[PDB]
Ligand binder design. Structure first.
Ligand SMILES: [Ca+2]
Ligand SMILES: [Cl-]
Length: 447
């Protein structure tokens, strides 16, 4: 059962298309969140995708024909496409867009000055006390659309609807906190059917606009998950996570989109708790916890090495560079392909018939282990000494592949990596080295 999606950050359409066929599909990833496909300002920086010029499908990722080719190929492979949608604003200043269109002083090919809120700057103190300014003023000089306008709503709804006709199945509503939920509610009335919709609301608490306001219009991103997972793996105790979710003050599980990191917070760096690809084995573990724990709708992040430059765009070379995969090195990192992360995804897919956390065990510090009923069990050792405890599981006796390190063979007599034994009483005598882990499930059992 598909349970996890991935953000192929700055991946062009031909690369996403190929990735769907030879990797995402076969592996069971449910969907791919793509970078904004609409016309945007020119420049090589990543953030240019967040400054729209028009709704024409001509971007850094490719043109309309290439976008449609990608949605056709991914769908045939069983993978949905979620489009990153800009509902709050258009580009700042004046310039040229990727399709040739010029704009300037709140004048675009599809909007005129009257379609925007009157200019004002959002200052850092407004987030805390002034909701009106967080929603009606300009986020870093970006022309704030008058999202209450029937015309603005029909123009955005028409873009969303053209995309669904092409075959797109979900949408990420960028910067939702800056759009009144009532406006998002009218817009949704104009959207045909019921596509997956997740809204980006950054709410760490004490904000004048809360994420709970967006629960009725779709899924919401729970940034507290990302923020708290990092503080816990970096400075806290994993034992604390026994009841991660609602008890930590997070929104309902069925309404949340969770991640260890996203394209924005992985850039900030230095003092900040977020765990990213730069943390190596720490990143594996955080991901294994996320993918094993039954909370939220998780998205795996796929980044590129930005080399300290937080404005830089992606590598010059494509991912699939003529039968030569450009992953894991100094260009694309390809985390969705990392042994522990992919294995975590395989775990989540095979334990979807039991969303409970059973037989939770910890050492009060950084060694944990828990099960998903009789569907699977896992353990993490984030300490410098071998984990040898005996834990209780609800699993059938026999030998299983630790899916974080290998898989079951065609004949089903062996695994390509470490094997874990479940005793007749249902226990496991753990033998997990320092900073390592295991995950086993019912469909990766020997002979
Ligand atoms: Ca706004
Ligand atoms: Cl996000």
């Amino acid at each position: 059962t598909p349970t996890t999606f991935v953000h192929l950050f700055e991946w062009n359409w031909q690369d996403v298309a190929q990735e769907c066929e030879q990797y995402l599909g076969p592996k069971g990833y449910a969907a791919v969140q793509v970078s904004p496909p609409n016309e945007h300002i020119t420049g090589s920086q990543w953030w240019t995708r967040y400054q729209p010029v028009s709704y024409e499908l001509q971007s850094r990722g490719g043109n309309r024909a290439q976008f449609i080719d990608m949605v056709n190929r991914c769908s045939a492979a069983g993978v949905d496409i979620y489009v990153d949608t800009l509902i709050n604003h258009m580009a700042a200043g004046s310039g040229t867009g990727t399709a040739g269109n010029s704009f300037g002083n709140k004048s675009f090919p599809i909007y005129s000055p009257q379609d925007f809120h009157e200019s004002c700057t959002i200052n850092n103190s407004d987030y805390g006390n002034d909701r009106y300014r967080v929603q009606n003023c300009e986020l870093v000089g970006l022309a704030d659309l008058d999202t209450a306008s029937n015309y603005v709503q029909n123009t955005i709804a028409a873009y969303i609807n053209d995309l669904q006709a092409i075959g797109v199945k979900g949408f990420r509503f960028d910067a939702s906190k800056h759009v009144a939920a009532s406006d998002i509610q009218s817009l949704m009335a104009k959207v045909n059917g019921s596509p997956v919709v997740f809204q980006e609301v950054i709410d760490q608490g004490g904000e004048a606009v809360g994420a709970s306001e967006y629960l009725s219009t779709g899924l919401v991103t729970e940034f507290k998950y990302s923020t708290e997972l990092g503080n816990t793996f970096r400075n806290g105790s994993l034992a604390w996570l026994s009841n991660f979710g609602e008890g930590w003050g997070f929104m309902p599980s069925s309404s949340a989109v969770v991640f260890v990191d996203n394209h924005d917070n992985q850039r900030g760096g230095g003092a900040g708790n977020v765990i990213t690809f730069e943390d190596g084995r720490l990143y594996d573990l955080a991901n294994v916890f996320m993918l094993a724990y039954p909370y939220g709708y998780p998205k795996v992040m796929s980044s590129y090495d930005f080399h300290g430059d937080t404005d830089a765009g992606g590598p010059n070379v494509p991912v699939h560079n003529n039968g030569n995969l450009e992953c894991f090195a100094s260009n694309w990192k390809c985390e969705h392909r990392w042994s522990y992360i992919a294995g975590g995804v395989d775990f989540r897919n095979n334990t979807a018939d039991n969303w409970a956390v059973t037989n939770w065990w910890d050492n009060t510090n950084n060694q944990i282990s828990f099960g998903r009923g009789s569907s699977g069990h896992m353990a993490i050792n984030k300490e410098d000494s071998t984990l040898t405890a005996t834990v209780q599981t609800d699993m059938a006796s026999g030998q299983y592949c630790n899916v974080l390190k290998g898989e079951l063979s065609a004949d089903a007599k062996s695994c390509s990596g470490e094997v874990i034994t479940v005793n007749s009483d249902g226990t496991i005598n753990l033998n997990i080295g320092a900073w390592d882990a295991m995950a086993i499930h019912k469909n990766a059992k020997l002979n």
